[PDB]
């Protein structure tokens, strides 16, 4: 048997319903989502980190000339100058006065700290949604992970539940993301091969251990000071460090809908947007005959206490007269009031107490008891606390 | 210098273009697409056998 239902996407708050066959006792269903995660299609593109100015020993030739040999290291710069008069601790390295030549060749290499400190680039799109559900259909309670796309049902006791796709394809992430130290930021980094000096992406590497890197640090060699063997070099500061000092606030606190971010793998969860539809396929063996369940007669409502707060604040005493003692489900067909419990145990000639939540000053709602209906009515009082520490359990009717 | 052109997708045929600047002699360019690959982005689900 095919049944359709809808669920506002939000964890914690439970959901109660009864499927009512025209000639058999209603079958109860309870649903509780635990975690609703949303994982994107994310493909890694590159990685960056601190760089280190690789500088060999200066190549000095004394009264002669030299040439440049390109090692083809990334962003290599080579230069030769004349008219050098170097010194050493033990006097003069040379005796020549002029014609001396010195050659400098400089480059960049990845810092030793690349493994533990490195910012990753990511291209995100195509969010897929997963969920953990705690569902009980006909006192068959289960906790299970389910693919809530438009296929992939999960079956237990013959009951086949299918959670359809979301009504909204919104995602908190932008197309290009940057990851670092477990924090996530939506940033527009320049793409591979187009890095610029003094900004993010000056040094470029396909992977952590690619061993082939592109670089634009704009390294410039300079004439060393006279009477000293050394090589002065000038370059823009680390754009990674400039971005480190800039660091706009994190997505964990900037995202709308209050979406929390964890990255063991990149994912976002526990934030309410849209609705998830549920499709039940129930086998015909789970339906029980009416005579095998208690049936009531002359049942009446009374409203004992009212507080139309966020939490359940309506207490109702229902007085009944039963042919049998046995548990049955109680349901409110409309959204006027939402009950707290999925089932209530029932004596022969006792009275039942029911907790519910409503936002109506003058509620008048029809409850469905084991096989009959009763019409509870009354007025209700405002709350006392201005703010609470939990969300709303009910809807806001117009 | 910015230049734009189009190449009909097919392999085995050389394609010719010329970059024509006003103040310099035209520069010819010849491009041959040796192999064009269509890589789907794919996932695994399960395996089966006897």
């Amino acid at each position: 048997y095919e049944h359709a239902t809808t669920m506002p996407s939000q964890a914690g708050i439970s959901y109660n319903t009864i499927v009512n066959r025209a000639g058999y006792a209603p079958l109860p269903i309870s649903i509780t989502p635990t975690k609703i995660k949303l994982i994107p299609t994310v493909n890694l593109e590159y990685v960056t980190c601190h760089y280190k100015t690789g500088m060999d020993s200066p190549a000095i030739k004394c009264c002669g000339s030299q040439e440049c040999t390109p090692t083809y290291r990334p962003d290599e710069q080579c230069k030769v100058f004349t008219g050098v008069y170097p010194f050493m601790w033990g006097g003069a390295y040379c005796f020549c006065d002029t014609e001396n030549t010195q050659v400098s060749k400089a480059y960049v290499m990845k810092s030793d700290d690349c493994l533990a400190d490195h910012a990753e680039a990511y291209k995100a799109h195509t969010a897929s949604v997963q969920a953990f559900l705690n569902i009980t259909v006909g006192e068959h309670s289960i906790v299970t992970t389910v693919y809530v796309n438009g296929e992939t049902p999960v079956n237990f006791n013959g009951v086949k539940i299918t959670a359809g796709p979301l009504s909204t394809a919104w995602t908190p992430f932008d197309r290009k993301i940057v990851q670092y130290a477990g924090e996530i930021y939506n940033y527009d980094f320049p793409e591979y091969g187009a890095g610029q000096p003094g900004a993010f992406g000056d040094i470029q590497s396909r992977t952590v251990s690619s061993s082939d890197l592109y670089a634009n640090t704009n390294l410039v060699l300079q004439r060393p000071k006279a009477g000293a063997i050394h090589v002065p070099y000038t370059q823009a500061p680390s754009g990674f460090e400039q971005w480190k000092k800039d660091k706009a606030p994190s997505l964990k606190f900037t995202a709308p809908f209050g979406c929390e971010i964890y990255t063991n793998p990149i994912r976002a969860e526990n934030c309410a947007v849209g609705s998830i539809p549920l499709a039940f396929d129930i086998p015909d063996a789970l339906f029980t005959r009416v005579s095998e369940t208690p049936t009531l007669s002359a049942a009446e409502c009374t409203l004992n206490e009212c507080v139309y707060s966020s939490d359940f604040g309506g207490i109702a005493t229902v007085k009944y007269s039963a042919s049998k003692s046995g548990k049955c489900a109680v349901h409110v067909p409309s959204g006027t009031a939402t009950l707290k419990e999925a089932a209530v145990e029932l004596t022969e000639q006792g009275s039942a107490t029911i907790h519910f939540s409503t936002a109506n000053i003058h509620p008048e709602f029809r409850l469905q008891i084991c096989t009959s209906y009763v019409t509870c009515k009354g007025d209700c009082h405002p709350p006392k606390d201005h703010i609470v520490t939990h969300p709303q359990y009910h809807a806001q009717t117009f | 210098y910015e230049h734009a052109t189009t190449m009909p997708s097919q392999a085995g045929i050389s394609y010719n273009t010329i970059v024509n600047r006003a103040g310099y002699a035209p520069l010819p360019i010849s491009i041959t697409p040796t192999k064009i690959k269509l890589i789907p982005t794919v996932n695994l689900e399960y395996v089966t056998c006897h």
Partner: nanobody
Amino acid sequence: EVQLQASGGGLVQAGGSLRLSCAASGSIVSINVMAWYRQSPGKERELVAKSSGPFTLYADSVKGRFTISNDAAKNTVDLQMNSLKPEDTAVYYCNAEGLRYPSGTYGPSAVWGQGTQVTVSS
């Protein structure tokens, strides 16, 4: 992205015994297949070893001499290579197929490492 890193090889005399290792890095949790292929100069690509879980398979010209072991926990394969003949010189590549990304953005199926050179001297 997922990659394969190959280590081992070198120049040795005939009759020696070496080990070739290939390791997988990236966003992977389980691997369905890992195999070895050899490419000699002037010829085409051929298979040598074939390991996946407990089962193993060997070619006609490699039986009884080379042994393949796989470690899915480390996602590595070790080809213990013995009884060298002059025809065994080639560049060896390690291949991985049926990759199950850990959701794990689905991506390319197969991968190919750079490989290692094995040369044998009479």
